[PDB]
Amino acid sequence: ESQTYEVFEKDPIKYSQYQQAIYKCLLDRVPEEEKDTNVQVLMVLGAGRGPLVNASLRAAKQADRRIKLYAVEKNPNAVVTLENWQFEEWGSQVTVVSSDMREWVAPEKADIIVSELLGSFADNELSPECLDGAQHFLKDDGVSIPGEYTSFLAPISSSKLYNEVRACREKDRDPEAQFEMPYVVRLHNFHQLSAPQPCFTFSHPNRDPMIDNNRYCTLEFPVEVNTVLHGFAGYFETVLYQDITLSIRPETHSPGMFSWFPILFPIKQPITVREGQTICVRFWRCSNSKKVWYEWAVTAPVCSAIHNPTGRSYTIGL
Amino acid sequence: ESQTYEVFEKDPIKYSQYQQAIYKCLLDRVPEEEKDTNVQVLMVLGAGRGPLVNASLRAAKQADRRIKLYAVEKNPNAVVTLENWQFEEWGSQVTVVSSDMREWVAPEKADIIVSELLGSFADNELSPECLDGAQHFLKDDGVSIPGEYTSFLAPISSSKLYNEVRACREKDRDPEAQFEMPYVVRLHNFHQLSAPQPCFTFSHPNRDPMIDNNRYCTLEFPVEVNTVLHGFAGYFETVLYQDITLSIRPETHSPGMFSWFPILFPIKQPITVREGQTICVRFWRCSNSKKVWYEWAVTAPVCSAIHNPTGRSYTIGL
Amino acid sequence: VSSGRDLNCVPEIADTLGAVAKQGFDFLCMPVFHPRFKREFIQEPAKNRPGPQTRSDLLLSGRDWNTLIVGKLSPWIRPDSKVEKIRRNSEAAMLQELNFGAYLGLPAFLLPLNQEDNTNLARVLTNHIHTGHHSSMFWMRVPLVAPEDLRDDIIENAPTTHTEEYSGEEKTWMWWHNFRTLCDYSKRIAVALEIGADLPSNHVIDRWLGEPIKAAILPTSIFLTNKKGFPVLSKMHQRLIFRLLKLEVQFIITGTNHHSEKEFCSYLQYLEYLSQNRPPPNAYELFAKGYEDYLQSPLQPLMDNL
Amino acid sequence: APACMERQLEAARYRSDGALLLGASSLSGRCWAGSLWLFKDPCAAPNEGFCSAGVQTEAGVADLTWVGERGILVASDSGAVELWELDENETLIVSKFCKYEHDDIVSTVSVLSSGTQAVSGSKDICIKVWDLAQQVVLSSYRAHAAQVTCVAASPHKDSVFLSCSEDNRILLWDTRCPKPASQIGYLPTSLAWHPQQSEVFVFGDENGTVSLVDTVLSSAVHSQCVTGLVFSPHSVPFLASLSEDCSLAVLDSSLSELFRSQAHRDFVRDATWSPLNHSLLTTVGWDHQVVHHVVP
Ligand SMILES: Nc1ncnc2c1ncn2[C@@H]1O[C@H](C[C@@H](N)CC[C@H](N)C(=O)O)[C@@H](O)[C@H]1O
Numbered sequence A, B: 001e002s003q004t005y006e007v008f009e010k011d012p013i014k015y016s017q018y019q020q021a022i023y024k025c026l027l028d029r030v031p032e033e034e035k036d037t038n039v040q041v042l043m044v045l046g047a048g049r050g051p052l053v054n055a056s057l058r059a060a061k062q063a064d065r066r067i068k069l070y071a072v073e074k075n076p077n078a079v080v081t082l083e084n085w086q087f088e089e090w091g092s093q094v095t096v097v098s099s100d101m102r103e104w105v106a107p108e109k110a111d112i113i114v115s116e117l118l119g120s121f122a123d124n125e126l127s128p129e130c131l132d133g134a135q136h137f138l139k140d141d142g143v144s145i146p147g148e149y150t151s152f153l154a155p156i157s158s159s160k161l162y163n164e165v166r167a168c169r170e171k172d173r174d175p176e177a178q179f180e181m182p183y184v185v186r187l188h189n190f191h192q193l194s195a196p197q198p199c200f201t202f203s204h205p206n207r208d209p210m211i212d213n214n215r216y217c218t219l220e221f222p223v224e225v226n227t228v229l230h231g232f233a234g235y236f237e238t239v240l241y242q243d244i245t246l247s248i249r250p251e252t253h254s255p256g257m258f259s260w261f262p263i264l265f266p267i268k269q270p271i272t273v274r275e276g277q278t279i280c281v282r283f284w285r286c287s288n289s290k291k292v293w294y295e296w297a298v299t300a301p302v303c304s305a306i307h308n309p310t311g312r313s314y315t316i317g318l
Numbered sequence C: 001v002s003s004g005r006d007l008n009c010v011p012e013i014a015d016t017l018g019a020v021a022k023q024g025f026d027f028l029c030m031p032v033f034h035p036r037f038k039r040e041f042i043q044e045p046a047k048n049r050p051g052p053q054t055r056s057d058l059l060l061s062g063r064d065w066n067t068l069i070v071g072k073l074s075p076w077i078r079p080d081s082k083v084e085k086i087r088r089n090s091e092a093a094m095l096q097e098l099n100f101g102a103y104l105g106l107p108a109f110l111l112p113l114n115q116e117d118n119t120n121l122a123r124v125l126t127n128h129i130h131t132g133h134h135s136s137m138f139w140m141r142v143p144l145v146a147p148e149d150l151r152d153d154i155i156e157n158a159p160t161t162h163t164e165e166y167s168g169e170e171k172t173w174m175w176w177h178n179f180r181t182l183c184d185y186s187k188r189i190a191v192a193l194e195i196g197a198d199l200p201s202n203h204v205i206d207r208w209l210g211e212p213i214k215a216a217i218l219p220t221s222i223f224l225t226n227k228k229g230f231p232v233l234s235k236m237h238q239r240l241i242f243r244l245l246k247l248e249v250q251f252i253i254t255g256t257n258h259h260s261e262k263e264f265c266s267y268l269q270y271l272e273y274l275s276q277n278r279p280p281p282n283a284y285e286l287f288a289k290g291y292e293d294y295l296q297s298p299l300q301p302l303m304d305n306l
Numbered sequence D: 001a002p003a004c005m006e007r008q009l010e011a012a013r014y015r016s017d018g019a020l021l022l023g024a025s026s027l028s029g030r031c032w033a034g035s036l037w038l039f040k041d042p043c044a045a046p047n048e049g050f051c052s053a054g055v056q057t058e059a060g061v062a063d064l065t066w067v068g069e070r071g072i073l074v075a076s077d078s079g080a081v082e083l084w085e086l087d088e089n090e091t092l093i094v095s096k097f098c099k100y101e102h103d104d105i106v107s108t109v110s111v112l113s114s115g116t117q118a119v120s121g122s123k124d125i126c127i128k129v130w131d132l133a134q135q136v137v138l139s140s141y142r143a144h145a146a147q148v149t150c151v152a153a154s155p156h157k158d159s160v161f162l163s164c165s166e167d168n169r170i171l172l173w174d175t176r177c178p179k180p181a182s183q184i185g186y187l188p189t190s191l192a193w194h195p196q197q198s199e200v201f202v203f204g205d206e207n208g209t210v211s212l213v214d215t216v217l218s219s220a221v222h223s224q225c226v227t228g229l230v231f232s233p234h235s236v237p238f239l240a241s242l243s244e245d246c247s248l249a250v251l252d253s254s255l256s257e258l259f260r261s262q263a264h265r266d267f268v269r270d271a272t273w274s275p276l277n278h279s280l281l282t283t284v285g286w287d288h289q290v291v292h293h294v295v296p
């Protein structure tokens, strides 16, 4: 909806980071001698209402470099905003494309592809699948902004959140479905039981012959207090370009950036944990041609059931 | 499963009809003078365990014409049966292809494409979508066997079947979902209230620029008795080649063919019908990129609710 | 007594089935794909290996697949391998074999629990279960005593543990327990308990008491030889057989003939002798027959008229 | 003489005069059996109509070995260890013994230095020492905790052999000791004793690394499991490495690559250096190809 895009646009830190990354990449690709002749092809993949298109334009003026823009957007309602901005302000420099980036036949190849397809668990909005499908129209020496992203997990204790998740039981569905799905939540009345550890990583472009976005991770969390495990908090980190990053992981959290709250992966049954014990968790990223999903289980100090098997309770549509 | 294929193979009438159709088509494409030089490319699309491959071979021996066969099958378990038959009996004349017909890159173009992708309501196994995807590797003058199929509907009264459908309520789903889905059923304790009428028709190949498998049909059923409407019986008819057909519509039912029982489309609420009144029904065939489904409603003598809106209770996976 | 023959070598399916039926066995546990035929699913040129991938379903009738055959997972399939390439080829091969079993309509399928970490094996099995209905059983092959715990003390610089480890002697029960907890107590997952030459301490055995044991695997190697040269069992092994007969488990004979002078059917003849000579059931055991673990609503003769 | 040789070639071994012994299995289709073949003309292999001798075995061939100049010792799927012999004319391969002693597939076999004894390894986790003249098992060892992958008899030490298993152990054996085995990351899959240095051996792993052990030097040679390791007949030997990655590599003393072949379309199963021309190396694979490599 229009107001979800408006909410994204209220975060100036996120766009100033994207602009700084594009500004740095343009200077590395085009030297001073070529500044007036060399026109860099830039494709904003998932342009929304256009704040990244404006960030790329400000970056090019800052870098004193020439750019040719393509603004790709599948949402036809956001395309209304885009085509009105293009006609009134952008002009011929910007070509608005109403298409899925995976289906789009590009007239030219891109020097830089820019996107913001990241969820609170980084890859949970299917940024790897989208970018993999758009990869073919990027030049051989082409750059993807973001270049990389990494998700993080941390075990948490919160009897309040366990009670909140429990209350999400619904009519006409599995009576325990609410425990087998993640929740975006500003975690408040909780306790982080161990330091966050990396879970899944993705790189762009994906210069690998055996492209597989499926993953299986085993995490060992040392616990120093007696407690109850109610779930896992998820965060992410991303490399836009070189040293220009974005983070929601608490120890490296990007100052004043509110675009993403943490994610919560619940467990069906609370697990007693003694001081000195290790929490062991297993997370899987799974897929088929139509859906992507997560599966998870605790194997230590005690076993849980495998949560969300075959994406029976929660899926991310392709 | 292996035993479902075995059950299909028990119907000799169905394969003798396919053989007769292929035999007739081979004589129309290759005259006597060309019989020893002209090799017809035949592709069995959805070859299962191979009875159509054997029917095409018997047809070619009958016609005294030369054929080159491709046996396309997506089910890898059926491909085990196929590759063993190919090695032991068929030889080089048959090339077994483990692929979805819509994804397959063909080495040659086909003179004839043969398939048996039909459900009890003809197009409910998605034979139009499958054949549309395979259409490109058929020669310009190429033939599809079947060439055409038509579904039929008839209003029925059956208090027993209404009770049977009602009893299909399940835990963890919409309490009325069972009324919003078709059932394959050998209808016994029932009353057909009006003569069957055509519902949806499909032709192969689909030589139309605006290919749309979506459909909307309005049927007017004159009723001559006082009764209760509990649903609609569905049947089909198909043209394999010229006068060689297959039918489950009762008035034209193919003698001794048991491969398909009728289909039942229930209604949530029984509808009183007076003698002299017309039953009016509306059926839609709907789709998206992932699913196909039916939607239906009675508009006369009284309105029903629209059944299975957006495929909430029943879908056919693409 | 219901008995099965376990084999890992089937040159011809019809001839093997026939020889096994002649011995008096009710069923055959066998590989559904050649146990040495490792398959590649990702890397060329081996992923493009020409078929058939296995032998045809047409070699037996549907009734024979449904009643006489228990399927077996290929021994190279290692979903919990530390090598990613081995893990991914193993996941794809596990699915392919389980799917072929479902295609065949097999009544049961054997999977081993031969190590502590079977998390990914559990995950691949749970996903298989949540793809259709099937009703088909999964028999988890788990020994009373782990192979690391029954190895000969013949490694001079790595001796066997001569210290009693109460909870450690019970390690295979924990392998089963974690597996079935991960799989969320599926009614389709049961135990095929493998009996060893030296029975563990009582505590280790009765850990399995209320567990869903569907089969008991007897290696030919655990049999002693009597005066006449026939295979027999120790008195303690006989005690365990009688407890397993009370649970109505299916008995599986595995391994080669270790009593060469005798026909192989002598292992089964002995088992059938023990079944025939089991302690008889009392008037209560006779009345209760058919009601074992069958749940009923307690009668309310005050509220209801009986 | 079988009318057809099975697709999955498992073994290739040259004897002194340069005649090539082949081992094959059918790992798919109706019948899962095997065959043994002799080719005095190795160029003619695997053509059935051009063999010196050929025979059908009961089950599949997982491994084989020459026993002198006329003996063929076979590791079978049936759990049997079989001994075959060429007749006086070497026109027939005849069975001498077939002893079913293993409880599962016999995976590996090796002749000890005496030439009168053999060692077998199996999926049944046991290692067996055989007396070839008496056709009996002298010793059965349950030292491992999982499937035995490879057994390699010492070149000149009669009572010495190496074993490796999925239990992650490489065991050095000496049957003269009351406790015969001694234990010496990624699972070991292949073993080869150095032909000149009595205390040296190479081992391959499931990840493609080949390592030099002087009872260390390692090289990431393959992208997949190292199936086999074969030393050349040279005064200064070269090492042939074969893998499930479908390639053959020829390595020097310091495990550095000298030759590479992508000739096979399926898994490379055996490698055998010609005694006639020491620069020639023959490989067999599951693609049914008998390739003759000219090693530089
Ligand atoms: N495969 C795809 N092809 C085209 N656009 C996509 C695709 N996947 C997601 N999008 C769009 O990408 C956008 C993602 C937004 N959350 C971000 C909007 C905008 N770039 C911003 O930073 O405000 C949405 O407008 C989606 O509709």
Ligand SMILES: Nc1ncnc2c1ncn2[C@@H]1O[C@H](C[C@@H](N)CC[C@H](N)C(=O)O)[C@@H](O)[C@H]1O
Pocket (backbone or CB within 6 Å): B005, B008, B009, B045, B046, B047, B048, B049, B050, B051, B052, B072, B073, B074, B075, B078, B099, B100, B101, B102, B115, B116, B117, B130
């Ligand atoms: N798009 C597709 N590509 C390939 N095979 C398909 C496709 N859709 C369905 N099939 C196969 O077509 C077959 C349809 C069967 N009901 C008929 C089997 C066989 N031709 C017979 O008449 O006995 C199945 O074996 C399906 O797996």
